[PDB]
Amino acid sequence: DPTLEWFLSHCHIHKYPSKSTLIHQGEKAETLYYIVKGSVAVLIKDEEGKEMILSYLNQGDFIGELGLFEEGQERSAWVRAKTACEVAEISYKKFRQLIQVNPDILMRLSAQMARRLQVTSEKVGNLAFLDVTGRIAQTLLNLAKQPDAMTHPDGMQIKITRQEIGQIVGCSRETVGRILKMLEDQNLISAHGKTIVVYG
Amino acid sequence: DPTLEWFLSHCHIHKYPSKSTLIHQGEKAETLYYIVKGSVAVLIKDEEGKEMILSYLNQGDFIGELGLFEEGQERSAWVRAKTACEVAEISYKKFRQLIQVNPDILMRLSAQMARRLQVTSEKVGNLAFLDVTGRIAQTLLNLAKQPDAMTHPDGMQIKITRQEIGQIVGCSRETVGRILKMLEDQNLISAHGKTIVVYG
DNA sequence: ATTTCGAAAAATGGGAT
DNA sequence: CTAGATCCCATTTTTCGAAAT
DNA sequence: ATTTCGAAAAATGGGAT
DNA sequence: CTAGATCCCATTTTTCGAAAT
Ligand SMILES: Nc1ncnc2c1ncn2[C@@H]1O[C@@H]2COP(=O)(O)O[C@H]2[C@H]1O
Numbered sequence: 001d002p003t004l005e006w007f008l009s010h011c012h013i014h015k016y017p018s019k020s021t022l023i024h025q026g027e028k029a030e031t032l033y034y035i036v037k038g039s040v041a042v043l044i045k046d047e048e049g050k051e052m053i054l055s056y057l058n059q060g061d062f063i064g065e066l067g068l069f070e071e072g073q074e075r076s077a078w079v080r081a082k083t084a085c086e087v088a089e090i091s092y093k094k095f096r097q098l099i100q101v102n103p104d105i106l107m108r109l110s111a112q113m114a115r116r117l118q119v120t121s122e123k124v125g126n127l128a129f130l131d132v133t134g135r136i137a138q139t140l141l142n143l144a145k146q147p148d149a150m151t152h153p154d155g156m157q158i159k160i161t162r163q164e165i166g167q168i169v170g171c172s173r174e175t176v177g178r179i180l181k182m183l184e185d186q187n188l189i190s191a192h193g194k195t196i197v198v199y200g
Numbered sequence: 201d202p203t204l205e206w207f208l209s210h211c212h213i214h215k216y217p218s219k220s221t222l223i224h225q226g227e228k229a230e231t232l233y234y235i236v237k238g239s240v241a242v243l244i245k246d247e248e249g250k251e252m253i254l255s256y257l258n259q260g261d262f263i264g265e266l267g268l269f270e271e272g273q274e275r276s277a278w279v280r281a282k283t284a285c286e287v288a289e290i291s292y293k294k295f296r297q298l299i300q301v302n303p304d305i306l307m308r309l310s311a312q313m314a315r316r317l318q319v320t321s322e323k324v325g326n327l328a329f330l331d332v333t334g335r336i337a338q339t340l341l342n343l344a345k346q347p348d349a350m351t352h353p354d355g356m357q358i359k360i361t362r363q364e365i366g367q368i369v370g371c372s373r374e375t376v377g378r379i380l381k382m383l384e385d386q387n388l389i390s391a392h393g394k395t396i397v398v399y400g
Numbered sequence: 401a402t403t404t405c406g407a408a409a410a411a412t413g414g415g416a417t
Numbered sequence: 418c419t420a421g422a423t424c425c426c427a428t429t430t431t432t433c434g435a436a437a438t
Numbered sequence: 439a440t441t442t443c444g445a446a447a448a449a450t451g452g453g454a455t
Numbered sequence: 456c457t458a459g460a461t462c463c464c465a466t467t468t469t470t471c472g473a474a475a476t
């Protein structure tokens with residue numbers, strides 16, 4: 001598109017191999033990122049390193065924007081690269097400037113923020129209102145909306161593990177597995193290895 | 201500041217008695233809200249009516265932002281007044297106009313959103329990583345610092361129901377009651393009716 | 401404002417499963 | 418195996434309109 | 439360089455507490 | 456109660472880098 005392009009013009013594009021961490025919770029935040037290509041996972045952990053996945057971000061989403069509005073802010077979570085990433089990088093100081101010349105770019109960001117607030121709130125509702133089976137069903141549909149989810153004549157297909165799912169819904173891999181098996185006995189999904197087919 | 205008194209001059213002011221509903225989850229979002237005076241509670245309901253408090257918002261806070269960035273959005277949650285409120289209202293349309301003649305007002309909107317994402321993500325963590333006692337201790341500490349908390353010779357005093365505390369942490373009122381009694385057993389808090397004294 | 405008084409409505413628990 | 422969700426009115430507690438200060 | 443292939447690694451299946 | 460958390464291990468998928476084309 002028009003605007004958003006000009007933005008990348010001041011960002012210092014970089015490359016991050018899969019598994020590499022782009023952001024570390026607790027660091028001083030001074031840089032705003034923009035995933036040009038690839039996808040990352042935003043996650044948090046407890047006092048024992050046990051991790052929960054807050055969200056997946058893909059090509060086109062901004063990253064590390066939370067420290068931009070208040071000074072002296074630290075990174076709110078860890079951002080790990082699920083795949084290989086081509087990430088633009090501009091400093092808050094410079095970004096605040098690009099806003100002046102063209103505020104439409106702040107609007108783009110704010111829209112994405114709004115969306116994350118909606119999703120995160122729904123994630124809170126889920127954690128407080130649904131049992132694991134519910135959270136898992138909802139996450140299966142959600143994963144089916146990701147851009148790296150393939151198509152299937154019976155619906156949609158995703159490639160993910162019972163381990164991962166557990167970190168998204170907040171349960172054990174053992175639990176996920178049992179429920180994944182059950183949902184099969186109801187022909188709601190198709191399970192075999194990292195490959196799961198969600199019937200539409 | 202100017203920008204505010206200017207913003208408010210284009211807004212339609214409304215008053216709501218405490219406990220009244222300001223926003224209905226589910227309806228079409230076409231209006232922006234700004235709390236001039238008073239405080240509200242943002243909350244979502246389950247299929248059976250069970251309530252989950254997502255946040256308390258006060259003076260200076262914007263409400264109903266989440267619709268602004270995209271067409272056909274519905275209110276993401278219910279907003280009920282805690283105290284009587286004086287709220288400034290403005291359509292999205294009219295608001296998109298004001299942003300263009302001073303996007304600084306959008307900067308402040310975005311600033312609040314970022315904060316909310318931080319707080320809501322941290323809530324996800326708490327629900328995921330902390331047990332009820334942990335969550336309840338956590339909430340009493342935060343409530344103990346809010347604007348409406350009263351000073352007490354032995355610390356800080358708050359008024360709230362076990363029921364409302366459960367709607368904040370995500371557990372039954374019964375559980376709150378038992379945990380509340382155990383916290384007193386450990387001289388951490390004094391509780392008489394809705395009056396809870398958090399020892400400093 | 402808010403202190404008082406009598407409902408009327410809300411909020412609590414207790415411990416068994 | 419085990420934090421807790423549930424069950425449930427008889428009993429508190431608190432809220433509120435009306436009147437008084 | 440890119441594809442093939444055969445161990446290591448990582449991810450599971452369920453019953454039991 | 457009663458969903459889930461945890462244990463335990465021997466088995467299935469997956470992952471990946473040395474080899475081969
Ligand atoms: N709940 C969430 N949903 C989506 N993205 C998030 C969430 N929490 C944090 N992030 C992202 O993770 C980043 C961590 O560092 P920042 O706080 O700078 O900015 C944060 C956001 O980009």
Ligand SMILES: Nc1ncnc2c1ncn2[C@@H]1O[C@@H]2COP(=O)(O)O[C@H]2[C@H]1O
Nearest residue numbers: 121255263264265266267275276277320
């Ligand atoms: N997690 C949250 N934290 C704070 N405020 C919220 C949260 N979720 C929703 N809201 C507010 O409640 C509003 C409900 O309607 P909107 O979706 O228009 O906009 C929402 C925000 O104003």
